[PDB]
Design a protein around this motif. Structure first.
Motif, PDB file in Angstrom:
ATOM      1  N   UNK A 284      50.569  37.188  -4.984  1.00 54.17           N
ATOM      2  CA  UNK A 284      49.409  37.885  -5.531  1.00 54.17           C
ATOM      3  C   UNK A 284      49.828  38.901  -6.584  1.00 54.17           C
ATOM      4  N   UNK A 285      50.864  39.687  -6.284  1.00 52.98           N
ATOM      5  CA  UNK A 285      51.328  40.690  -7.240  1.00 52.98           C
ATOM      6  C   UNK A 285      51.810  40.016  -8.519  1.00 52.98           C
TER       7      UNK A 285
ATOM      8  N   UNK B 189      38.549  36.687 -12.994  1.00 56.23           N
ATOM      9  CA  UNK B 189      39.190  37.283 -14.159  1.00 56.23           C
ATOM     10  C   UNK B 189      39.750  36.215 -15.083  1.00 56.23           C
TER      11      UNK B 189
ATOM     12  N   UNK C  57      47.118  38.793 -21.018  1.00 53.26           N
ATOM     13  CA  UNK C  57      46.034  39.465 -21.728  1.00 53.26           C
ATOM     14  C   UNK C  57      46.573  40.457 -22.752  1.00 53.26           C
ATOM     15  N   UNK C  58      47.636  41.183 -22.401  1.00 52.85           N
ATOM     16  CA  UNK C  58      48.190  42.185 -23.306  1.00 52.85           C
ATOM     17  C   UNK C  58      48.798  41.537 -24.542  1.00 52.85           C
TER      18      UNK C  58
ATOM     19  N   UNK D 292      48.779  38.599 -10.576  1.00 53.21           N
ATOM     20  CA  UNK D 292      48.020  39.629 -11.280  1.00 53.21           C
ATOM     21  C   UNK D 292      48.811  40.188 -12.455  1.00 53.21           C
ATOM     22  N   UNK D 293      50.114  40.411 -12.263  1.00 51.88           N
ATOM     23  CA  UNK D 293      50.938  40.900 -13.362  1.00 51.88           C
ATOM     24  C   UNK D 293      51.018  39.876 -14.488  1.00 51.88           C
TER      25      UNK D 293
ATOM     26  N   UNK E 141      52.734  35.532   0.345  1.00 46.08           N
ATOM     27  CA  UNK E 141      51.412  35.638  -0.259  1.00 46.08           C
ATOM     28  C   UNK E 141      51.249  36.950  -1.013  1.00 46.08           C
TER      29      UNK E 141
ATOM     30  N   UNK F  51      50.359  47.922 -10.967  1.00 41.95           N
ATOM     31  CA  UNK F  51      51.653  47.742 -10.322  1.00 41.95           C
ATOM     32  C   UNK F  51      52.746  47.462 -11.344  1.00 41.95           C
ATOM     33  N   UNK F  52      52.785  48.248 -12.419  1.00 44.74           N
ATOM     34  CA  UNK F  52      53.747  48.008 -13.487  1.00 44.74           C
ATOM     35  C   UNK F  52      54.413  49.307 -13.924  1.00 44.74           C
TER      36      UNK F  52
ATOM     37  N   UNK G  96      49.891  37.802 -26.774  1.00 45.87           N
ATOM     38  CA  UNK G  96      49.147  36.641 -27.214  1.00 45.87           C
ATOM     39  C   UNK G  96      49.183  36.416 -28.710  1.00 45.87           C
ATOM     40  N   UNK G  97      48.024  36.113 -29.293  1.00 43.59           N
ATOM     41  CA  UNK G  97      47.952  35.816 -30.717  1.00 43.59           C
ATOM     42  C   UNK G  97      48.170  37.090 -31.521  1.00 43.59           C
TER      43      UNK G  97
ATOM     44  N   UNK H 178      46.010  48.281 -22.387  1.00 45.04           N
ATOM     45  CA  UNK H 178      44.725  47.827 -21.873  1.00 45.04           C
ATOM     46  C   UNK H 178      43.834  48.975 -21.425  1.00 45.04           C
TER      47      UNK H 178
ATOM     48  N   UNK I  35      52.557  33.714 -35.528  1.00 43.75           N
ATOM     49  CA  UNK I  35      51.288  34.072 -34.904  1.00 43.75           C
ATOM     50  C   UNK I  35      51.372  33.975 -33.385  1.00 43.75           C
ATOM     51  N   UNK I  36      51.729  32.799 -32.875  1.00 42.52           N
ATOM     52  CA  UNK I  36      51.869  32.570 -31.446  1.00 42.52           C
ATOM     53  C   UNK I  36      53.235  31.967 -31.170  1.00 42.52           C
TER      54      UNK I  36
ATOM     55  N   UNK J  10      45.954  45.663 -10.748  1.00 41.10           N
ATOM     56  CA  UNK J  10      46.609  46.175  -9.554  1.00 41.10           C
ATOM     57  C   UNK J  10      47.386  47.458  -9.808  1.00 41.10           C
TER      58      UNK J  10
ATOM     59  N   UNK K 140      40.843  37.375  -8.917  1.00 39.72           N
ATOM     60  CA  UNK K 140      41.783  36.747  -9.839  1.00 39.72           C
ATOM     61  C   UNK K 140      41.166  35.529 -10.508  1.00 39.72           C
TER      62      UNK K 140
ATOM     63  N   UNK L 164      48.622  37.722 -15.250  1.00 41.25           N
ATOM     64  CA  UNK L 164      47.335  37.837 -15.930  1.00 41.25           C
ATOM     65  C   UNK L 164      47.356  38.986 -16.926  1.00 41.25           C
ATOM     66  N   UNK L 165      47.809  40.157 -16.474  1.00 40.55           N
ATOM     67  CA  UNK L 165      47.775  41.339 -17.328  1.00 40.55           C
ATOM     68  C   UNK L 165      48.704  41.168 -18.522  1.00 40.55           C
TER      69      UNK L 165
END
Lengths: 98, 49, 49, 49
Positions: free
Chosen positions: B24-25, D30, B35-36, B28-29, B20, C16-17, B38-39, C23, A11-12, C14, D27, B31-32
């Motif tokens: 930042x890049x 989010x 999110x994409x 954010x990557x 910096x 940037x990928x 995971x479980x 998503x 699962x994870x 962003x 960020x 984070x994405x």
């Protein structure tokens, strides 16, 4: 000499440390060569061994859980499939009930 | 010496700027990507992930 | 957890990928090409009108 | 020319400042939203979400 196993979903993603199965021994005679092993399924569906452990020492006649620690951690990821196989290649001849 | 100090400070500011922006890049990557992925559903719940 | 304070969601990207990814639900009148990310920016893919 | 270059550099630094502050706020918001939302129990596991 009869081995049985089932597929396990992930699962994870995490690191595995131990494997468990519900089994016991029929008679109270001494037993050995009872192995619990883990197989990763590749893209082609082939199974590759990534760990095994002897569990004959801690087995009990009563139906109880058997938990055994792997020799080393095996990283797993979500989406792949794993098989926990019980081998039971004993020498004395006492059967194993799963 | 004043101009040399200004040169050093500007170089330090440029280093901070690039660090910096890269951070930042990367954040954010991250984070994405989190999110994409995971479980995922286990094998007994479904055939598909 | 019947009732709970609904936090106002916020999302950012962003772009940037490598690919647009899962998503983004993509719909176009071209038929085959969709919004494509190139050079770190989203843009139109293909020469179609 | 020196004062003009200083003006241009200050404008660039202000642009970088505002962009970085906005990116930081976005960020953090989010991440907070992602933490607040996420996996919910299916219909069969329980009645409530």
């Amino acid at each position: 000499g009869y081995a049985i196993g089932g597929y396990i979903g992930i699962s994870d993603t995490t690191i595995v440390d131990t494997i468990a199965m519900k089994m016991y021994k029929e008679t109270s005679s001494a037993i050995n060569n009872v192995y619990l092993e883990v197989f990763r399924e590749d893209s082609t569906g082939a199974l590759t061994s990534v760990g095994s452990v002897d569990v004959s020492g801690q087995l009990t006649t009563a139906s109880d859980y058997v938990e055994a620690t792997l020799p080393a951690g095996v990283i797993v990821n979500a989406g792949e499939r794993y098989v926990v196989r019980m081998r039971n290649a004993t020498t004395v001849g006492n059967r194993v009930g799963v | 010496s004043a101009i040399s100090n200004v040169i050093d400070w500007f170089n330090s500011l440029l280093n901070f700027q690039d660090t910096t922006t890269s951070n930042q890049i990367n954040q954010q990557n991250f984070q994405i990507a989190t999110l994409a992925s995971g479980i995922k559903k286990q094998q007994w719940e479904c055939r598909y992930s | 957890a019947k009732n709970l304070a609904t936090t106002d969601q916020s999302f950012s990207d962003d772009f940037n990928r490598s690919a647009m990814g899962g998503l983004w639900f993509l719909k176009s009148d071209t038929g085959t090409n969709q919004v494509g990310v190139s050079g770190g920016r989203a843009a139109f893919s293909g020469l179609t009108d």
